Structure formats: C-alpha cells, structure tokens
Design an enzyme around this catalytic site. Structure first.
Site, mmCIF file in Angstrom:
data_model
loop_
_atom_site.group_PDB
_atom_site.id
_atom_site.type_symbol
_atom_site.label_atom_id
_atom_site.label_comp_id
_atom_site.label_asym_id
_atom_site.label_seq_id
_atom_site.Cartn_x
_atom_site.Cartn_y
_atom_site.Cartn_z
ATOM 1 N N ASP A 18 57.430 -7.121 5.588
ATOM 2 C CA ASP A 18 57.788 -5.747 6.014
ATOM 3 C C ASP A 18 58.122 -4.809 4.881
ATOM 4 O O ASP A 18 59.208 -4.848 4.254
ATOM 5 C CB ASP A 18 58.966 -5.886 6.975
ATOM 6 C CG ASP A 18 59.348 -4.562 7.603
ATOM 7 O OD1 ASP A 18 58.647 -3.560 7.352
ATOM 8 O OD2 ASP A 18 60.346 -4.575 8.346
ATOM 9 N N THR A 19 57.158 -3.939 4.560
ATOM 10 C CA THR A 19 57.344 -3.004 3.448
ATOM 11 C C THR A 19 58.378 -1.949 3.739
ATOM 12 O O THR A 19 58.879 -1.269 2.850
ATOM 13 C CB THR A 19 56.027 -2.300 3.072
ATOM 14 O OG1 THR A 19 55.513 -1.607 4.241
ATOM 15 C CG2 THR A 19 54.970 -3.306 2.628
ATOM 16 N N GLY A 20 58.737 -1.751 5.015
ATOM 17 C CA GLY A 20 59.786 -0.795 5.296
ATOM 18 C C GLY A 20 61.170 -1.374 5.232
ATOM 19 O O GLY A 20 62.092 -0.562 5.430
HETATM 20 C C1 LIG Z 1 68.610 -2.910 4.402
HETATM 21 O O1 LIG Z 1 67.568 -3.820 4.757
HETATM 22 C C2 LIG Z 1 67.029 -3.505 5.964
HETATM 23 C C3 LIG Z 1 67.403 -2.346 6.647
HETATM 24 C C4 LIG Z 1 66.709 -2.064 7.823
HETATM 25 C C5 LIG Z 1 65.765 -2.914 8.350
HETATM 26 S S1 LIG Z 1 64.853 -2.516 9.806
HETATM 27 O O2 LIG Z 1 64.423 -3.810 10.395
HETATM 28 O O3 LIG Z 1 65.699 -1.679 10.710
HETATM 29 N N1 LIG Z 1 63.531 -1.598 9.465
HETATM 30 C C6 LIG Z 1 63.795 -0.471 8.585
HETATM 31 C C7 LIG Z 1 62.928 0.749 8.916
HETATM 32 C C8 LIG Z 1 63.091 1.162 10.388
HETATM 33 C C9 LIG Z 1 63.226 1.956 8.028
HETATM 34 C C10 LIG Z 1 62.280 -2.283 9.200
HETATM 35 C C11 LIG Z 1 61.180 -1.912 10.207
HETATM 36 O O4 LIG Z 1 59.909 -2.362 9.726
HETATM 37 C C12 LIG Z 1 61.436 -2.514 11.591
HETATM 38 C C13 LIG Z 1 61.307 -4.041 11.652
HETATM 39 C C14 LIG Z 1 61.742 -4.862 12.879
HETATM 40 C C15 LIG Z 1 62.079 -6.294 12.444
HETATM 41 C C16 LIG Z 1 62.464 -7.155 13.655
HETATM 42 C C17 LIG Z 1 61.258 -7.169 14.616
HETATM 43 C C18 LIG Z 1 60.986 -5.732 15.099
HETATM 44 C C19 LIG Z 1 62.231 -5.146 15.747
HETATM 45 C C20 LIG Z 1 63.373 -5.094 14.731
HETATM 46 C C21 LIG Z 1 63.700 -6.537 14.312
HETATM 47 C C22 LIG Z 1 63.001 -4.256 13.514
HETATM 48 C C23 LIG Z 1 60.598 -4.899 13.875
HETATM 49 N N2 LIG Z 1 60.376 -2.043 12.508
HETATM 50 C C24 LIG Z 1 60.612 -1.140 13.474
HETATM 51 O O5 LIG Z 1 61.731 -0.659 13.649
HETATM 52 O O6 LIG Z 1 59.503 -0.846 14.185
HETATM 53 C C25 LIG Z 1 59.703 0.019 15.332
HETATM 54 C C26 LIG Z 1 58.573 1.065 15.286
HETATM 55 O O7 LIG Z 1 57.412 0.310 15.652
HETATM 56 C C27 LIG Z 1 57.807 -0.610 16.669
HETATM 57 O O8 LIG Z 1 57.204 -1.875 16.418
HETATM 58 C C28 LIG Z 1 58.195 -2.793 15.976
HETATM 59 C C29 LIG Z 1 59.550 -2.270 16.475
HETATM 60 C C30 LIG Z 1 59.313 -0.784 16.566
HETATM 61 C C31 LIG Z 1 65.432 -4.103 7.699
HETATM 62 C C32 LIG Z 1 66.090 -4.366 6.496
#
Ligand SMILES: COc1ccc(S(=O)(=O)N(CC(C)C)C[C@@H](O)[C@H](C[C@]23C[C@H]4C[C@H](C[C@H](C4)C2)C3)NC(=O)O[C@H]2CO[C@H]3OCC[C@H]32)cc1
Ligand SMILES: [Cl-]
Ligand SMILES: [Cl-]
Ligand code: NA
EC number: 3.4.23.16
Lengths: 99, 99
Positions: free
Chosen positions: A25-27
């Site tokens: 996860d690059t985000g």
């Molecule tokens: C400080 O370090 C971190 C701080 C924050 C995060 S995060 O998980 O909240 N996030 C940060 C980002 C929102 C700026 C990473 C994301 O890639 C997150 C990654 C997730 C990891 C895991 C599986 C799923 C739900 C949740 C738990 C967040 C995607 N994806 C996400 O929120 O996606 C949403 C938009 O598209 C939809 O598809 C997926 C959910 C939704 C991780 C480490």
C-alpha cells in the site's frame, strides 16, 4: 515482479514466524499488521485514515519477509482486517510505482 | 515516470478545471477526494477505511487528469484526510507496482 493493479496487490509475508497475506500500500506511511504478538518493547501510537483513527502498538526493528525479500523496520500492530505493507518497508525492497 | 516511496507519492491532479494534490494509493480500491462541486447526479456509497465506515458521494464518468495522464471514471467525494487516487484510476493511467 511487476504487479498489475486490476486487483488488490496482495503478497505473502512472513513475520514473527507466521505466514500472512498483506496488501502492498503506497498510501500507507507505515506498516500495520493485524493483532499478533511480537517480541520486544513497544509504545502506543494513533494512526488515522478514512473514518478516523485507531490505536496501535509500535514495535521497532522488526524483520519481515515480503514476497521473498527480507526487510527491517517499525511495524504497527492493531485492529485492521487486512495486513498493510507501507512505505517504510516498501522502500527497503525497492518497490516503485511506474506508469 | 518511476516513483520511489521514500516520500509520499503526491501528484498534481486536475478535476473540475482546478488543480489539487493527491496521493497515489495502491491500497485504495476507489478514488476519494475532499468536498468539491462536481457536475451531474451522484449515488450513495459506504466505504470502509482504517478508522471505520463513512458515507461518500459517488460521481461516475468524471474527467480527471492525473500527473498529466487523462482518466475518465468514478470519483467519490467525502471526508478524507488527503485526496487519494485508487486503483480504479491507477489502472487507467497504466500504473504498476514493481520490485
Ligand atoms: C501512519 O500509517 C498509516 C496511516 C494510515 C493508514 S490507512 O490504512 O488509513 N490508509 C491511509 C490513506 C487513507 C491516506 C491507507 C489506504 O490505502 C487504505 C488501506 C486500507 C487497509 C485495510 C484494508 C482496507 C480498509 C482499511 C484497512 C484501510 C484498505 N485504503 C482505503 O482507505 O481505501 C478506501 C478507498 O478505497 C476503498 O477501498 C479500500 C477501502 C476504501 C495506514 C497506515
Ligand atoms: Cl521504519
Ligand atoms: Cl531507491
Ligand atoms: Na524492538
């Protein structure tokens, strides 16, 4: 490898002696693993994303194996339904985004 | 371009004639942008982030430029800590993960 993004980019990792599936996860700034025990000291942290914040335990200097490549760095442990490999460990395996 | 991950993979996007900053996010299935005005009708969507579930507005077939590459696709509008470009548009601009 070259990983397409038509599907979630899931790989196998090994951490704490356990095999797990995780999302590249690059985000994510940091790596976040579902609830598990790790050796060593830890300190509390809050991390936030869509939907707000969760409380996690921060463990430093933990080794992971990510798709066959060893890395070391901080790992956050907490209530996530999916294991997240974040930038702090993606850099160590030389992952890049290309287009 | 080849983008390493030592810093956040931030790019400039153009949507609604306006320039904004967004994070390229391989862990997002969907693209989510902060509150803005978009043309046409929207539909409801619930999406689940690290902190829990939020309601967003789903706008389909929206023109958006991402780091200079043209995409036309679904954009979710709602409270996100940062604008995120998820896999539905990363695939349109031909992005892959490589290591
Ligand atoms: C400080 O370090 C971190 C701080 C924050 C995060 S995060 O998980 O909240 N996030 C940060 C980002 C929102 C700026 C990473 C994301 O890639 C997150 C990654 C997730 C990891 C895991 C599986 C799923 C739900 C949740 C738990 C967040 C995607 N994806 C996400 O929120 O996606 C949403 C938009 O598209 C939809 O598809 C997926 C959910 C939704 C991780 C480490
Ligand atoms: Cl680290
Ligand atoms: Cl490098
Ligand atoms: Na430690």
């Amino acid at each position: 490898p070259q990983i397409t993004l038509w599907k979630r980019p899931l790989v196998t990792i090994k951490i704490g002696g356990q095999l797990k599936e995780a999302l590249l996860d690059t985000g994510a700034d940091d790596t976040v693993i579902e609830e598990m025990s790790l050796p060593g000291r830890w300190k509390p942290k809050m991390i936030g994303g869509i939907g707000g914040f969760i409380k996690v335990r921060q463990y430093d200097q933990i080794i992971i194996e990510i798709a066959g490549h060893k890395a070391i760095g901080t790992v956050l442990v907490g209530p996530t339904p999916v294991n997240i490999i974040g930038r702090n460990l993606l850099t160590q395996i030389g992952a890049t985004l290309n287009f």
